[PDB]
């Protein structure tokens, strides 16, 4: 009478390390608690007043940032429900580029309120149906909340003003300068064709001079040196070769069969003459810069130096393709001289040193080109990485604006308006789904609440003021960051705007993740065993 045996049936047949959780308390409440914990971990990094977190992964690498997706990626999340929410956040990052923290916070609030509803008496099916109805209502409402449109994407000032809000959450203090940089870089790209490519914006991180010294270059920068003696060309005529800069050899097996003394004495001289002829044929087309994707032979280098030809050796084929795009050359597969169509052109190619790193610069004087690069300076590697993350967020925002030009007021104004309208709609709806609809509406309060908490004010006063102001009829009013007391101000005139498409996708994904978590009723976890990767 001192031991409780395992119940007969499945409990006894379970494996040695496996776990089985079933029912509300064992499974659903535990999943909700785990998701709430994850949301709490990421909550403090939300908004302009969000705080960076220094995360060290299993490889002893240091990450400091407030980008929610990066933080979740570097955290070794183990609880499977939190894993599902992290997958939702990563999907939001991949689809849009911003709103990962919104997805996480909204999902956490939804799951918390779902636990509340389950405790007061509702069933899982009713809560799920209520959330689905409320999500449909929110997606219907949102297009009516659009305040203005981009209406121009070739203007530097307009694009910078549009992109300021996206890169104000990260790098709050100095966002105008970064906005101008990213606006110039994006306007260089995005030709008359409506298609915009994110990969056409390259980022080069050169350490030392503070991030205020960063600039935008219409071309590319490679952190390497020239093979030859020539180190500067002012009327570049780049000829790109994907093959090694050496005499091509057979593919099965090549052996030099010598049968007489004369052949032995003439072989090396003939090979050298052939290489010289090939290099001179290349040079006679006017080409003065040669870019090769492979190694450079010594004889080829010597003959290129004789004919005053600049040699650059690109290790990665991705860089070779990007250079071909940005110059206008075709990567030849042999050592044949390039025809006039395949010959690339650039305004200036030269070797230069920035800080203590030698770089090769392919610079265009024109305000155009397929590929543009941003040279990031700074006093720390981590700082430059964070600035690069902010640049990526801004570029993704520009891409979204190209896809959809509609914008909604930021600073929690859209969330408060959505909450108010969904609460109004849910009151008219009878049945047991009204509780779920009202909780879905209330879950939108977590965004202004997080903003107010991070700004250091009382969230409740801010939310009450927002409801009041939206009650008179101002739907473009959000909280004011630059105030020590809870206060609100108009966001349309302040320019604090976030993309409509981002909000739409974030709401959809967060709702889907919360519903998917709620649908689970049993968990059968296998023995963790190993799995290093």
């Amino acid at each position: 009478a001192l031991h409780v045996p395992k119940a007969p049936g499945f409990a006894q047949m379970l494996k040695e390390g496996a776990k089985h959780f079933s029912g509300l308390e064992e499974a659903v409440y535990r999943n909700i608690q785990a998701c709430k914990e994850l949301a709490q971990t990421t909550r403090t990094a939300y908004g302009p007043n969000g705080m960076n977190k220094m995360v060290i992964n299993h490889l002893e690498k240091l990450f400091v940032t407030n980008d929610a997706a990066t933080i979740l990626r570097e955290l070794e999340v183990q609880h499977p429900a939190a894993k599902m929410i992290v997958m939702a956040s990563h999907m939001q990052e991949q689809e849009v580029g911003d709103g990962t923290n919104f997805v996480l916070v909204f999902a956490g609030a939804l799951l918390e309120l779902a636990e509340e509803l389950l405790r007061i008496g509702l069933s899982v099916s009713e809560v799920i149906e209520g959330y689905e109805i409320a999500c449909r209502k929110a997606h219907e409402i949102l297009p009516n909340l659009v305040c203005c449109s981009a209406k121009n994407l070739r203007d530097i000032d307009e694009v910078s003003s549009l992109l300021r809000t996206s890169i104000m959450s990260k790098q709050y203090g100095n966002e105008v300068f970064l906005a101008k940089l990213i606006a110039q870089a994006c306007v260089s790209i995005f030709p008359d064709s409506g298609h915009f490519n994110v990969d056409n914006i390259r980022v080069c991180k050169i350490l030392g001079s503070g991030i205020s010294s960063s600039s935008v270059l219409h071309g590319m920068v490679f952190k390497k040196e020239t093979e030859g003696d020539v180190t500067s060309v002012k009327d570049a005529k780049i000829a790109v070769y994907s093959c090694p800069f050496d005499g091509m050899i057979t593919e099965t097996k090549g052996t030099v069969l010598i049968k007489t003394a004369e052949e032995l004495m003439n072989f090396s001289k003939g090979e050298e003459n052939l290489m010289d002829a090939q290099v001179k044929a290349i040079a006679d087309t006017g080409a003065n810069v040669v870019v090769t994707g492979g190694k450079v032979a010594d004889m080829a280098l010597h003959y290129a130096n004789k004919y005053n030809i600049m040699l650059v050796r690109l290790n990665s084929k991705w860089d070779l393709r990007r250079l071909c795009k940005t110059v206008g050359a075709t990567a030849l597969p042999r050592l044949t001289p390039p025809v006039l169509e395949e010959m690339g052109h650039c305004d200036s190619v030269y070797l230069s040193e920035v800080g203590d790193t030698q770089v090769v610069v392919f610079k265009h004087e024109k305000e155009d080109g397929a590929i543009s690069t941003i040279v990031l300076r700074g006093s720390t590697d981590n700082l430059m990485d964070d600035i690069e993350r902010a640049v990526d967020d801004g570029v993704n925002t520009f891409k979204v604006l190209t896809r959809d030009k509609r914008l909604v007021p930021g600073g929690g104004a859209t969330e408060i308006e959505l909450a108010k309208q969904i609460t109004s709609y849910g009151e008219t709806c009878p049945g047991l789904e009204q509780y779920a609809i009202k909780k879905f509406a209330e879950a939108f309060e977590a965004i202004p609440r997080a903003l107010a908490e991070n700004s250091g004010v009382k969230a409740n006063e801010v939310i009450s003021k927002l409801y009041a102001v939206h009650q008179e009829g101002n739907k473009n009013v959000g909280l004011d960051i630059e105030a020590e007391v809870p206060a609100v101000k108009d966001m349309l005139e302040a320019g604090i705007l976030d993309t409509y498409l981002g909000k739409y996708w974030a709401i959809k994904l967060a709702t889907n993740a919360a519903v998917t978590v709620l649908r689970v009723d049993q968990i059968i976890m296998a023995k963790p065993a190993g799995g290093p990767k």
């Binding site: 499945f10 006894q12 494996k15 057979t250 052949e263 689970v520 799995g531």
Partner: protein, 527 residues
């Protein structure tokens, strides 16, 4: 203790009633776990692997495979369910439930001193009668689109969310009707199932063509060709080494260059054959070639093809040869010795889609494709896996319905009627096998019980309501999962595959009979 333990000391043995107790306990445990899967109102289970992969599922076979169980009887039942899934593609949870209830009902009499042999004899007599009744009750009907839609709904609603099921029904029925040749067996290999991971779950749809998970490897090839000729080939266009160890011998750099230029003549001949065919077929820029190759293409040949405005794909799947020849309508070529415009397929639109680091090529707007693809879209990997399993079940269900014109009313109506018929037939069975017949009928009654239980209603009261309605009316009334009242499953549209029911009866009876007759379990292969 026993003989085996005497001969082999490190042996585990269960004898006489111990074997029956062990087997019945294992069956009861499996049944207790799988009770909650049955029906569209069943609960969704979450499975985490050792590596941490998350799988949301409701399928009985999928759940059984991902169980953390090492029991022998569980292994036997899992094998039976695996066979059921392999052949009919549905009814795994019903299989497990019926086996467990058969064993429980048999034990209910065996514990009263009755021998298992009599129970098995009653089981086989009841199975014969039940098969006769199922033959009587099936609804032979030519199946237009509506009946197939009803069957696909009856499966997919049980597998996934209602709205996702509504989309998947149209998808699966249209695909099956597209690939179905007249009075010919349906080849399910001709429906490619491709997963993309960017849109929502309801964005999955049917493409009247083909989708390939790879794209052109040359940046200069066209990303979208409006009018396209299709060349499906199984010829390697990359460099090939001689089988008999050739090696090259030269005495000068010029000779080496000559040998290098002349070592690609063999491949260049085939490339120029393709180029000549393309120039003969289309002399303008309106049309174009898409060359899908099962074998690789080296960069030289890719460049040579791109210079002529030809998009080429390499390393295609083996099944894609048949799929393209059935969709585009060309001829798969293993050599270019005699290639003519008549062997070229056609496609009304070919374009490439980029998703992250993966390329997808769409071959659609075919004339009358006999092979289509089901593009599965979702935000999560586990969502994609769940949709793929549901689509497999729906495809199997629709194909099963097409195979035989009959279809069986669902919602447990058939089991209720079968149990009543067995009870009526019981006096005709001579001897104590009437006990086995009664046990078989009560075991068949498990499906409405579990359906009513999962729907939240009372079990016994709902079942007696259904049985009373069926007895007084004679109709095939099932369980209405919304109200618990009797409902005519035929009129509403809750249909079940006749082959699935027949397989359930046969396999469940066979395995239960074999298990009941087991009187010893031995593990003495060690040492």
């Amino acid at each position: 203790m026993a003989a085996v333990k005497t001969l082999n000391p490190k042996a585990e043995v269960a004898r006489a009633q111990a074997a029956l107790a062990v087997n019945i306990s294992a069956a009861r445990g499996l049944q207790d776990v799988l009770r909650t899967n049955l029906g569209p109102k069943g609960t969704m289970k979450m499975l985490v692997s050792g590596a941490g992969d998350i799988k949301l599922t409701k399928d009985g076979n999928v759940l059984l495979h991902e169980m953390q169980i090492q029991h022998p009887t569980a292994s036997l039942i899992a094998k039976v369910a695996t066979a059921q899934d392999d052949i009919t593609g549905d009814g795994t949870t019903s299989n497990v439930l019926i086996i467990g209830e058969l064993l429980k009902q048999a034990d209910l009499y065996i514990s009263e001193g009755l021998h298992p042999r009599i129970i098995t004899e009653g089981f086989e007599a009841a199975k014969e009668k039940a098969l006769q009744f199922l033959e009587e009750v099936k609804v032979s009907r030519e199946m237009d689109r509506e009946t197939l839609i009803d069957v696909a709904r009856t499966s997919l609603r049980t597998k996934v969310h209602a709205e996702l099921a509504d989309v998947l029904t149209e998808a699966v029925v249209d695909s099956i009707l597209a690939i179905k040749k007249q009075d010919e067996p349906i080849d399910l290999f001709m429906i490619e199932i491709m997963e993309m991971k960017h849109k929502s779950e309801t964005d999955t749809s049917l493409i009247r063509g083909l989708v390939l998970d790879h794209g052109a490897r040359h940046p200069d090839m066209k990303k979208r060709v409006e009018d396209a000729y299709i060349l499906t080939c199984n010829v390697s266009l990359e460099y090939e080494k001689t089988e008999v160890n050739s090696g090259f011998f030269y005495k000068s750099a010029e000779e080496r260059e000559k040998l290098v230029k002349a070592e690609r003549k063999f491949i260049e001949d085939r490339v120029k054959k393709i180029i000549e065919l393309k120039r003969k077929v289309c002399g303008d820029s309106d049309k174009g070639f898409v060359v899908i190759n099962q074998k690789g293409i080296d960069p030289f040949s890719l460049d040579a093809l791109s210079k002529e405005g030809i998009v080429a794909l390499r390393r295609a799947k083996r099944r894609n040869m048949e799929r393209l020849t059935l969709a585009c309508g060309g001829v798969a070529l293993n050599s270019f010795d005699d290639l003519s415009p008549d062997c070229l397929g056609h496609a009304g639109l070919v374009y490439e889609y980029t998703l992250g680091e993966e390329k997808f090529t769409f071959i659609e707007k075919c004339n009358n494709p006999r092979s289509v693809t089901l593009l599965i879209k979702g935000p999560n990997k586990h969502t994609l896996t769940q949709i793929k399993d549901a689509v497999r079940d729906g495809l199997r269900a629709v194909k099963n319905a097409i195979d035989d014109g009959c279809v069986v009313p669902g919602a447990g109506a058939v089991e209720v009627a079968m149990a009543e018929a067995l009870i009526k037939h019981k006096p005709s069975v001579k001897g104590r096998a009437q006990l086995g017949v009664q046990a078989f009928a009560d075991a068949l009654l498990i499906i409405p019980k579990v359906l009513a239980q999962n729907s939240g209603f009372d079990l016994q009261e709902t079942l007696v309501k259904i049985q009373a309605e069926h007895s007084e009316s004679g109709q095939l009334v099932g369980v209405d999962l919304n109200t618990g009242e009797p409902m005519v499953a035929a009129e509403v549209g809750v249909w079940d595959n006749y082959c699935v029911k027949k397989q359930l009866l046969h396999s469940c009876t066979v395995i239960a009979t074999n298990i009941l007759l087991v009187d010893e379990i031995m593990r003495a292969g060690m040492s």
